Amino acid sequence: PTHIAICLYYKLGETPLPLVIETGKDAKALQIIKLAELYDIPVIEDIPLARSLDKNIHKGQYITEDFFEPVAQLIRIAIDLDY
């Protein structure tokens, strides 16, 4: 509990892979979580995944192969199907 928040973005025709578009630790993590509620962004607690993303995938970077399926699973849960 160093607090960590990893913000993932995936859009077809833009994003060839899921992108880490923001990250935060400590106070910035808390702010990100507050912004996530304000904008109704799904937030998932997964401590090993969050720690591993934080170490490996920096802001502005695409995810790498070890993360493809764990992140896909989050996307399937979080996607707004728009109806």
């Binding site: 160093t2 913000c7 979580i33 996530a36 304000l38 904008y39 937030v43 998932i44 607690e45 996307i75």
Partner: peptide, 17 residues
Amino acid sequence: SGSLANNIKKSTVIVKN
């Protein structure tokens, strides 16, 4: 100013510890 918020607004999912 606002880039943080605009990135959160458009994002798909947040992973936290």
